[PDB]
Design a protein around this ligand. Sequence first.
Ligand SMILES: *[C@@H]1O[C@H](CO)[C@@H](O)[C@H](O)[C@H]1NC(C)=O
Ligand SMILES: *[C@@H]1O[C@H](CO)[C@@H](O)[C@H](O)[C@H]1NC(C)=O
Lengths: 55, 54
Amino acid sequence: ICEDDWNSGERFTCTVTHTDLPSPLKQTISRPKGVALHRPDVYLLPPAREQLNLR
Amino acid sequence: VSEEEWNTGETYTCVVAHEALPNRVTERTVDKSTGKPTLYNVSLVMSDTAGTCY
Ligand SMILES: *[C@@H]1O[C@H](CO)[C@@H](O)[C@H](O)[C@H]1NC(C)=O
Ligand SMILES: *[C@@H]1O[C@H](CO)[C@@H](O)[C@H](O)[C@H]1NC(C)=O
């Protein structure tokens, strides 16, 4: 399925019908909209000169 | 002293003796290594390696 469709929160559930438990069980998978979206600020710090000096 | 003897690296000391001395005797020495130098190739290296000497 599309990434964006899942991001919309389709809440897929794999319906399972079993003899011991007549009632089908639902297990939703979706993205909670409450969580914010802040872009990472990725920083790449080179090796400390104290590492290179030790060589 | 001989000219060629001084040319090689043989050091001398002119130990003098004076009353007004702590040890009562003063020793001072020289050699060609102590003479006037000509060349000075100071390397004066500059390195980020700071803590360790050399
Ligand atoms: C000093 O001069 C000599 C030539 O007389 C040279 O071979 C040497 O590299 C010089 N020292 C330096 C550049 O540190
Ligand atoms: C300085 O000059 C001499 C040449 O008499 C040379 O052998 C020596 O390597 C030089 N110093 C350095 C740090 O290279």
